Amino acid sequence: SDVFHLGLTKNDLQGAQLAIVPGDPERVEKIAALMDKPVKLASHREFTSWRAELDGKAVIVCSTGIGGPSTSIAVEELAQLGIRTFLRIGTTGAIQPHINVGDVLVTTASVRLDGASLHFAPMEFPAVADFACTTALVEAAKSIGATTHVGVTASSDTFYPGQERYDTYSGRVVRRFKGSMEEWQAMGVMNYEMESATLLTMCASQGLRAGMVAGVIVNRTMKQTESHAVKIVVEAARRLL
Amino acid sequence: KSDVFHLGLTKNDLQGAQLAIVPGDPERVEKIAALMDKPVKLASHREFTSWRAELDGKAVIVCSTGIGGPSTSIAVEELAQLGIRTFLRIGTTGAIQPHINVGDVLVTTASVRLDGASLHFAPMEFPAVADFACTTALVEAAKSIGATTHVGVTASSDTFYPGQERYDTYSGRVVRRFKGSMEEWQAMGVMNYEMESATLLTMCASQGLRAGMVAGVIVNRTQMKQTESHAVKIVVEAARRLL
Amino acid sequence: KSDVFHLGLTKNDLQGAQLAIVPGDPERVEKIAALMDKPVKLASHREFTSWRAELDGKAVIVCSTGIGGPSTSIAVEELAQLGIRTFLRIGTTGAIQPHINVGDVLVTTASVRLDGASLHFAPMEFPAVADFACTTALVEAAKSIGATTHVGVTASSDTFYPGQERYDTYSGRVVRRFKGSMEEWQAMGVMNYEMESATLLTMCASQGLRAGMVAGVIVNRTQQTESHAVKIVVEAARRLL
Amino acid sequence: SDVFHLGLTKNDLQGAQLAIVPGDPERVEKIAALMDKPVKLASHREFTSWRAELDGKAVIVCSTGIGGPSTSIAVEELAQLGIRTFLRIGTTGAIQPHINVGDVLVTTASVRLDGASLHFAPMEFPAVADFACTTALVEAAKSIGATTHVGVTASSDTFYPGQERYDTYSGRVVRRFKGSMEEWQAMGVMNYEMESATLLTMCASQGLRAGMVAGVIVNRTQQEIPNSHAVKIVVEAARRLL
Amino acid sequence: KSDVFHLGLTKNDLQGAQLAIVPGDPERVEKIAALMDKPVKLASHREFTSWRAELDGKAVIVCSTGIGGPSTSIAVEELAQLGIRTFLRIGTTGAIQPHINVGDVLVTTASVRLDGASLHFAPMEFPAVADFACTTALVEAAKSIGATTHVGVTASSDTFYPGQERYDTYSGRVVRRFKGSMEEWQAMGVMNYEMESATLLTMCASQGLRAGMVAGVIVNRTQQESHAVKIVVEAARRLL
Amino acid sequence: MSKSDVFHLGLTKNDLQGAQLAIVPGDPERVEKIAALMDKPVKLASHREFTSWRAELDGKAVIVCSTGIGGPSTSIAVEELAQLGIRTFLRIGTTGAIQPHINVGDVLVTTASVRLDGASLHFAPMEFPAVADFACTTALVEAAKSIGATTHVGVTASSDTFYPGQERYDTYSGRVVRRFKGSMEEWQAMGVMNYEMESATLLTMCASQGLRAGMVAGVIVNRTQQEIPNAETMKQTESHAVKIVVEAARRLL
Numbered sequence A: 001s002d003v004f005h006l007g008l009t010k011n012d013l014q015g016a017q018l019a020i021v022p023g024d025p026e027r028v029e030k031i032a033a034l035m036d037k038p039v040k041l042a043s044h045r046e047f048t049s050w051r052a053e054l055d056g057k058a059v060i061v062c063s064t065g066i067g068g069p070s071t072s073i074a075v076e077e078l079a080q081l082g083i084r085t086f087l088r089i090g091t092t093g094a095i096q097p098h099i100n101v102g103d104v105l106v107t108t109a110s111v112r113l114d115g116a117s118l119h120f121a122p123m124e125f126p127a128v129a130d131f132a133c134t135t136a137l138v139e140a141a142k143s144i145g146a147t148t149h150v151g152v153t154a155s156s157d158t159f160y161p162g163q164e165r166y167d168t169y170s171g172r173v174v175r176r177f178k179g180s181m182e183e184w185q186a187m188g189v190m191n192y193e194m195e196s197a198t199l200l201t202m203c204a205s206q207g208l209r210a211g212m213v214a215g216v217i218v219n220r221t222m223k224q225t226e227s228h229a230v231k232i233v234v235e236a237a238r239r240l241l
Numbered sequence B: 001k002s003d004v005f006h007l008g009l010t011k012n013d014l015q016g017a018q019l020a021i022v023p024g025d026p027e028r029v030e031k032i033a034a035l036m037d038k039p040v041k042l043a044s045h046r047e048f049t050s051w052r053a054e055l056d057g058k059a060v061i062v063c064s065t066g067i068g069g070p071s072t073s074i075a076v077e078e079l080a081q082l083g084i085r086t087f088l089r090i091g092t093t094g095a096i097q098p099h100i101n102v103g104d105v106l107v108t109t110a111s112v113r114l115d116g117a118s119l120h121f122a123p124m125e126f127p128a129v130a131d132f133a134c135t136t137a138l139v140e141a142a143k144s145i146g147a148t149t150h151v152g153v154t155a156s157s158d159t160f161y162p163g164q165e166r167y168d169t170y171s172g173r174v175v176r177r178f179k180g181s182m183e184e185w186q187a188m189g190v191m192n193y194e195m196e197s198a199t200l201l202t203m204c205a206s207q208g209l210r211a212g213m214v215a216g217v218i219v220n221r222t223q224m225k226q227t228e229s230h231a232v233k234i235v236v237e238a239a240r241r242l243l
Numbered sequence C: 001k002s003d004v005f006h007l008g009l010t011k012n013d014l015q016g017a018q019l020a021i022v023p024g025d026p027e028r029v030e031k032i033a034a035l036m037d038k039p040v041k042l043a044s045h046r047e048f049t050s051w052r053a054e055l056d057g058k059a060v061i062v063c064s065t066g067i068g069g070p071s072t073s074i075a076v077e078e079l080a081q082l083g084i085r086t087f088l089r090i091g092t093t094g095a096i097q098p099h100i101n102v103g104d105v106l107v108t109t110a111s112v113r114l115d116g117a118s119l120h121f122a123p124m125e126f127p128a129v130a131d132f133a134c135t136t137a138l139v140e141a142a143k144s145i146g147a148t149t150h151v152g153v154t155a156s157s158d159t160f161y162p163g164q165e166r167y168d169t170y171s172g173r174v175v176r177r178f179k180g181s182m183e184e185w186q187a188m189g190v191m192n193y194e195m196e197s198a199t200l201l202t203m204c205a206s207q208g209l210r211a212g213m214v215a216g217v218i219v220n221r222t223q224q225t226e227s228h229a230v231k232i233v234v235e236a237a238r239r240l241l
Numbered sequence D: 001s002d003v004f005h006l007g008l009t010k011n012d013l014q015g016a017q018l019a020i021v022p023g024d025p026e027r028v029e030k031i032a033a034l035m036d037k038p039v040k041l042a043s044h045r046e047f048t049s050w051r052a053e054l055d056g057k058a059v060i061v062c063s064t065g066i067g068g069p070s071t072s073i074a075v076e077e078l079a080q081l082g083i084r085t086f087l088r089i090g091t092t093g094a095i096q097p098h099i100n101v102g103d104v105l106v107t108t109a110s111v112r113l114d115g116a117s118l119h120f121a122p123m124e125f126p127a128v129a130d131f132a133c134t135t136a137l138v139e140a141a142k143s144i145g146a147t148t149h150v151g152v153t154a155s156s157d158t159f160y161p162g163q164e165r166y167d168t169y170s171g172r173v174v175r176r177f178k179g180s181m182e183e184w185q186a187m188g189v190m191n192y193e194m195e196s197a198t199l200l201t202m203c204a205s206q207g208l209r210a211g212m213v214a215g216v217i218v219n220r221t222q223q224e225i226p227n228s229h230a231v232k233i234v235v236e237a238a239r240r241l242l
Numbered sequence E: 001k002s003d004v005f006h007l008g009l010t011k012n013d014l015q016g017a018q019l020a021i022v023p024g025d026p027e028r029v030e031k032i033a034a035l036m037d038k039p040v041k042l043a044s045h046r047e048f049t050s051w052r053a054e055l056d057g058k059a060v061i062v063c064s065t066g067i068g069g070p071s072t073s074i075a076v077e078e079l080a081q082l083g084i085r086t087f088l089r090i091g092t093t094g095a096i097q098p099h100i101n102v103g104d105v106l107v108t109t110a111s112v113r114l115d116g117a118s119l120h121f122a123p124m125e126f127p128a129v130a131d132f133a134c135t136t137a138l139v140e141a142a143k144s145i146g147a148t149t150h151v152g153v154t155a156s157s158d159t160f161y162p163g164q165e166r167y168d169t170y171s172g173r174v175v176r177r178f179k180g181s182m183e184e185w186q187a188m189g190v191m192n193y194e195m196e197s198a199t200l201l202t203m204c205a206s207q208g209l210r211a212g213m214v215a216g217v218i219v220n221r222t223q224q225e226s227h228a229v230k231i232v233v234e235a236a237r238r239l240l
Numbered sequence F: 001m002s003k004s005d006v007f008h009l010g011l012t013k014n015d016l017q018g019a020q021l022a023i024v025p026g027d028p029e030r031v032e033k034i035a036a037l038m039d040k041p042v043k044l045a046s047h048r049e050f051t052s053w054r055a056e057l058d059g060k061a062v063i064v065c066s067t068g069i070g071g072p073s074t075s076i077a078v079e080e081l082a083q084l085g086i087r088t089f090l091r092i093g094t095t096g097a098i099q100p101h102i103n104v105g106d107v108l109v110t111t112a113s114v115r116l117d118g119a120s121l122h123f124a125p126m127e128f129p130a131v132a133d134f135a136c137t138t139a140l141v142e143a144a145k146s147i148g149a150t151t152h153v154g155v156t157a158s159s160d161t162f163y164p165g166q167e168r169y170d171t172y173s174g175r176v177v178r179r180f181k182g183s184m185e186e187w188q189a190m191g192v193m194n195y196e197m198e199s200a201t202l203l204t205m206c207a208s209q210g211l212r213a214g215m216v217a218g219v220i221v222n223r224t225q226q227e228i229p230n231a232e233t234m235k236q237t238e239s240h241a242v243k244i245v246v247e248a249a250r251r252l253l
Ligand SMILES: O=c1ccn2c(n1)O[C@H]1[C@H](O)[C@@H](CO)O[C@H]12
Pocket: A023, A065, A066, A067, A090, A091, A092, A093, A159, A163, A192, A193, A194, A195, A217
């Protein structure tokens, strides 16, 4: 291997320059299977990678695991291997009452409630998505006529307190996040997830292109959800090759 | 009879306008409105000069913001009170990237928040991101005129001098926070420096208002009229696609 | 035509002036200048309108700063480049103390830094303090004409609305940082709110320039004026030449 | 499942109140194999769990995945399931010249270079380990005579810039971390890893006991990346905390 | 006269001492030194009163720090300059947990940094953590002496009043940062409040010096706004 | 509870005899020295680093109470004196200047301080200015002229430490944390006159609570110069600053 965690070589990519990066290792093959010539490359820790072809061009599908830390590793190492465009496809919890489960959300930028983004750029730097990528995802969503929402996403380092969930062992939420969901709601934030702030910030600050699309699994205020989002990211990828 | 404290405008003055082109300089307002139909001066107070025009049958506003986020936040807030829901920032700018030459146009997707006013609307973690529809319209408008466009991040500073790491000053000093900062932004891909977008984009993105920004490159420190006109033509054309 | 980028002034225009009275509104410039000898217009570009006058045979400058720290920072810097060493800001303001009434004059000793520009000159730990000689001159000038004067701290905000905790706005909301802030500043003895002193005082105190500020209260949140505050700033300037 | 990510029920724990939490899912079975009656429970995302028995008491081994975010989910849900004591066993990069690859490092407290810890306590709060757990780990390392070091650990949200690694795609390190390794080194910090700040902070601020131990796989004073003792110690330490 | 600027002590005055017991009140220095062999007064300047004593044939220093991290940082630094490598703070404290009783002994593993001096040695992310051997010696010494002991986190405040959310004050005002803070620390398991440990533990842990912290509970905040000394002395014995 | 209205100072309101102004030096040993410049001085109490005396100035009761080193001990003294009735505080110290033109023996009157402390934050957020009261500053400047000293009026850097916070490297570790590396040069360039360790807390806690506070100090050493005053760096310069704080107090009664 040429990289420390992924266990991949540059030749394994076969010139691929775009990568679809879901969070769950088990979703990798499902995505790769939607394209031509899907082939498993490796599986180490939460990093499962597959290669496939889209319109004749090699494409990579690699899981990031949950959180900005594991995401930063996958992105960095894929970048070392030649990837220049990253499209995250995940699951999300909507916090706006007009966003129903199954809906598709395309993120323009994220509220940085993580710690990893800070390892790439100061907080003043926007965790903004690449225009080309965001455009491709939006156009793709329209192509299949999915109910799409485009906007800001709150990206948290935690699934519980950072998303102001009180149904926990302690039932406590630190001052910083107490009442934070209502604040994000009033600010128009669409949803919560846990990897976009790191992904977008590390890419926008290093000349890498990144997009973010997610399927609504819950509304903080069923199956054809992921499929639609997955179809969208694969279609978007076609326009970014 | 004004409905707002600084702009000296009434909702009636807007004639139903919901979109506003917001340049920084009052002297540029008429020239912009002059590109549209039935342009009429509304008012002039402080750095806030406003004109009303018509685009494809719809009333549009052109109002200056003055220099800086503080002045901008006043114009935007009061315009919002008057009914404006879409704001398009137009201006001329320098550049900090070698590949960006004078005459090019820049469309800002998001801004580095080197201001103070944005913090009065959303914590620093919140992105000073532009509205997708506005950014799309600006890029495509730039497209239709064959403009050489650069789409990316802009550093928005509360100062013209130290915040943009200029040393040709009275003190010749730059506070620790900004020493070596220009090279850091360059390495991070930032296209340029300007002084109102962080405030504009943040206050709009966090209040359900649509905002976008386009600027003509007239200078490049790392290295005049046509550039401007193009930028101006682009913002008006974009406005047309957002009414 | 000009030795500076924005003001459109040359050192020659100042005729050796070392002190400038800096109101925020360009319209107030001529009126202030008119109280001195040989007043004459100098230039007008953007929100920067300048006039020159004379006091006790010494040249004095009156130049507007526009609204906010950003425009103020430009004016102060360029005036400093032209030779100005003493700056006296004069404005109108809204008091937040129940016993500071409309018509009263306020002399600021230092300001709460609720701006962004002051940070481009000194870290937050540094005090946005006024020069002692300037503050003394303003206080002594205020007492020579018998105005009801209050000397103390002022809150300097980058915004007219949320930063001064106003809810009579489009969104009707105030970000967490500022919710309940006016009551806190009140309890801390802060006299009023304005929008340029934090930047002015900080940039001058950290660069060897003298700055002071006086303002007339024309309204009180908790429930001719120009002429007096203006009279005070000119009499004070006289003592600083 | 009683929890959203682990796919476990309280019954799966069989009364277990202590969990050994490695970062790598593939290390779980290996740890469980050193104990009695090892049984696989589940595997979802980066969370692989096994149950085993130690001195007639049930013990859980569950991976956290890399980083504080994944770790915070594992710890929280295990806590919901009844776990009250957590012992992290991981791998680490030493930043002191005389620490050898293979050495066992027991963490007393961590430098919070993460973001998740802040979701449980403000930065002023110490990412300190529980005294009983730390004592158990040290004492255990003592009974098997392993080369051990006890001290502070820098816990980063990134493997690369946050640990000041420059052999990267960009080759740059943001201002905040430029020259940071030298500073931690001068401050006596022993090593780098990526989960302790979160683990220790979230546990110490919620009445949960946590211990941290790791084996050195690279010495950063020499190289950024390399070309069972710690595992035996965490199991033996666990015996003492039952 | 004096090899250090504030303490008025010379390296010769320590007679090879490498461990110092550092109480806050200068008036308690003599008392502590009295529990050991050959106690001798060394100096008294400002809030710094120092005595030298002997424990199991080894020189030991007892020196007051005065109240707060600033005065503490001076004493620790200058004592370090004179050769001290291990510091054991012994103080008084107010418990904020209902189960901790007045008279109980508290051993601090790490402190919440509500001070400013610690930041002069390490950024906030760094833990104000006690030395492991010192903490162990204190816990063990507590068993030996016999006392209801609690081991845990301590909140170290730069103020006695607003920082410990006390309202019995002239203004009766507590700044936003500290409003409702005591209940937050309570929920997070913090045992008590004191004012020197964050600075002490941080400056020591970040400079290769060993530090331990033990205190006697003199009040319990959930109710209102000699074991420890014997324990710190016994712990010192185990650390020589 | 041994006839004290406060927890640390061991003083009662009766002890102040109506005093409303307090001179607050840092060293308890200097309290008696300062009280000696006034009439009928009497020692009130001595507890921890808090030594207090009462004296008469132009026939009015005045308190002199040490604060100890640092904002924490200072905040205790000021708060408890406030509870007892003090409304005006004048700090008098000896300090080391960081400006080349500020010579030993000079007197420094502080208008505001750089908050390099932690206690000030317990009274007001960092954005708040650690500014001195105008009346107090005026009295100190005027008294300086009555005495005839070479005075400098300006900003002071108030640090929670004597060593790294004042960027001193002659220490056990010989290192200075990132935040303070190169900080002295920055403060010098910003016109900061000197370093001391109590003003940020004193000025902030008073300005944010309706109390008046002033700060004056004698320059007994200069961080930029090679030579250092003899055995008595303090005494003469110290006496100058002390004479001034007392003279200033007279105008604030
Ligand atoms: O509220 C939600 C809903 C879904 N997700 C989320 N927050 O975080 C994302 C993690 O990858 C993981 C957390 O379960 O899946 C995504």
